[PDB]
Design a protein around this motif. Structure first.
Motif, PDB file in Angstrom:
ATOM      1  N   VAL B   5     -44.544  46.634  10.967  1.00  0.00           N
ATOM      2  CA  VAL B   5     -43.538  47.452  11.621  1.00  0.00           C
ATOM      3  C   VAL B   5     -43.843  47.474  13.109  1.00  0.00           C
ATOM      4  O   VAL B   5     -44.960  47.188  13.543  1.00  0.00           O
ATOM      5  CB  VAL B   5     -43.489  48.879  11.035  1.00  0.00           C
ATOM      6  CG1 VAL B   5     -44.728  49.663  11.432  1.00  0.00           C
ATOM      7  CG2 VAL B   5     -42.215  49.600  11.446  1.00  0.00           C
ATOM      8  N   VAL B   7     -42.409  49.760  16.737  1.00  0.00           N
ATOM      9  CA  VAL B   7     -41.577  50.786  17.350  1.00  0.00           C
ATOM     10  C   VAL B   7     -41.401  50.400  18.809  1.00  0.00           C
ATOM     11  O   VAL B   7     -42.369  50.383  19.577  1.00  0.00           O
ATOM     12  CB  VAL B   7     -42.196  52.180  17.213  1.00  0.00           C
ATOM     13  CG1 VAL B   7     -41.343  53.207  17.929  1.00  0.00           C
ATOM     14  CG2 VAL B   7     -42.364  52.546  15.748  1.00  0.00           C
ATOM     15  N   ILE B  17     -36.583  50.493  16.082  1.00  0.00           N
ATOM     16  CA  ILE B  17     -37.599  50.221  15.072  1.00  0.00           C
ATOM     17  C   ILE B  17     -37.282  48.887  14.418  1.00  0.00           C
ATOM     18  O   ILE B  17     -36.148  48.660  13.987  1.00  0.00           O
ATOM     19  CB  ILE B  17     -37.661  51.329  14.006  1.00  0.00           C
ATOM     20  CG1 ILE B  17     -37.923  52.688  14.648  1.00  0.00           C
ATOM     21  CG2 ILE B  17     -38.729  51.014  12.976  1.00  0.00           C
ATOM     22  CD1 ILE B  17     -37.972  53.814  13.656  1.00  0.00           C
ATOM     23  N   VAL B 148     -46.116  47.273  19.769  1.00  0.00           N
ATOM     24  CA  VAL B 148     -47.115  46.460  19.089  1.00  0.00           C
ATOM     25  C   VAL B 148     -46.717  46.323  17.629  1.00  0.00           C
ATOM     26  O   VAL B 148     -46.206  47.266  17.018  1.00  0.00           O
ATOM     27  CB  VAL B 148     -48.519  47.075  19.230  1.00  0.00           C
ATOM     28  CG1 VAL B 148     -49.579  46.075  18.807  1.00  0.00           C
ATOM     29  CG2 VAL B 148     -48.750  47.537  20.655  1.00  0.00           C
ATOM     30  N   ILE B 149     -46.944  45.140  17.070  1.00  0.00           N
ATOM     31  CA  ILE B 149     -46.646  44.869  15.669  1.00  0.00           C
ATOM     32  C   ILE B 149     -47.860  45.281  14.844  1.00  0.00           C
ATOM     33  O   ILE B 149     -48.908  44.634  14.899  1.00  0.00           O
ATOM     34  CB  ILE B 149     -46.295  43.394  15.445  1.00  0.00           C
ATOM     35  CG1 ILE B 149     -45.150  42.973  16.363  1.00  0.00           C
ATOM     36  CG2 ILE B 149     -45.911  43.157  13.993  1.00  0.00           C
ATOM     37  CD1 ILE B 149     -44.867  41.489  16.338  1.00  0.00           C
ATOM     38  N   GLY B 150     -47.716  46.352  14.072  1.00  0.00           N
ATOM     39  CA  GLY B 150     -48.811  46.894  13.293  1.00  0.00           C
ATOM     40  C   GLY B 150     -48.557  46.775  11.804  1.00  0.00           C
ATOM     41  O   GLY B 150     -47.412  46.744  11.354  1.00  0.00           O
TER      42      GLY B 150
END
Ligand SMILES: [Zn+2]
Ligand SMILES: [Zn+2]
Lengths: 148, 153
Positions: B5, B7, B17, B148-150
């Protein structure tokens, strides 16, 4: 080098900071950071398993615990991988810290979240139902994803 | 991981999102979500090399290009791994997003987890602008919102 990372901590409050990670050796990871806007005292610092910021810091999940261990302090071998203990904020609210960890490894926490709490981590010694679970550190104040 | 995910946040009204999901090893990655506050039209949609945003766009760096190729669109063979093309904001500023790409991945050398996803100011010309800037950023312009892609559950 076996990996480096950085996490910018932000929340719906005055707390904010920057923490960096550097895998010195395969078995030792350096953690250094500076966080401002904290109440003077001890604050728990933990790596959670999900880098999901869609709901403040609540969607980040539990302490990163891939080995299925109990909550502990950094000096306990039986601890969550994300258990980093407390950091102390001075009278001005600034917490500067520098620590090495022998269980947390940079490649395994990329994409996960780093959270600082409102209260002290009892390191599993508080005689509380949350001691062996979270450390009874209270509300989450700021979080951020461990970025490449 | 199988899910991720991101944001998107910025100094302006741009925010949204974006979800990620990959069900096959090195297979397709479904990219879907929503963004609001944009100007109507096409906007660049890229994954940059680093998630470090201490310096903003300077520390995030260029497009995630591990294979050392020139800029392109997602359908092109000569592309950056982080080249995902454009998204479409309607007349209300909302960009309902849905992309499927197999050059990116949630694992391996092309893994995008922990990197920066950016929606840009202008539309990506897919590396067909005639100038050298087209071969770098597609003239997509400045960063409107990033994140950031977490790893997600
Ligand atoms: Zn713990
Ligand atoms: Zn590109």
């Amino acid at each position: 080098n076996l990996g480096a990372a950085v996490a910018i901590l932000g929340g719906p409050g005055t707390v904010q900071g920057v923490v960096r990670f550097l895998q010195l050796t395969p078995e030792r990871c350096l953690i250094e950071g500076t966080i401002d806007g904290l109440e003077p005292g001890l604050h728990g610092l933990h790596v959670h398993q999900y880098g999901d910021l869609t709901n403040n810091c609540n969607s980040c999940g539990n302490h990163f615990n891939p080995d299925g261990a109990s909550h502990g302090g950094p000096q306990d071998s039986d601890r969550h991988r994300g258990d980093l203990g407390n950091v102390r904020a001075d009278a001005d609210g600034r917490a500067i810290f520098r620590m090495e960890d022998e269980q947390l490894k940079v490649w395994d926490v990329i994409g996960r979240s780093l959270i600082i709490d409102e209260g002290e981590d009892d390191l599993g010694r508080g005689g509380h139902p949350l001691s062996k679970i979270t450390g009874n550190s209270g509300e989450r104040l700021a979080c951020g994803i461990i970025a490449r | 991981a199988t899910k991720a995910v991101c944001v998107l946040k910025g100094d302006g009204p741009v925010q949204g999102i974006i979800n990620f999901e990959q069900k096959e090893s090195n297979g397709p990655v479904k990219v879907w979500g929503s963004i609001k506050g944009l100007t109507e039209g096409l906007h660049g949609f890229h994954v940059h090399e680093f998630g470090d945003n201490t310096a903003g766009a300077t520390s995030a760096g260029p497009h995630f290009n591990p294979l050392s190729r020139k800029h392109g669109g997602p359908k092109d063979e000569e592309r950056h791994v982080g080249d995902l093309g454009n998204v479409t904001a309607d007349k209300d500023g909302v960009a309902d997003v849905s992309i499927e790409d197999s050059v990116i991945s949630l694992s391996g050398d092309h893994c995008i987890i922990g990197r920066t996803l950016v929606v840009h100011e202008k539309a990506d010309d897919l590396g067909k602008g005639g100038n050298e800037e087209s071969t770098k950023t597609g003239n997509a312009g400045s960063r409107l919102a990033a994140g950031v892609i977490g790893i997600a559950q």
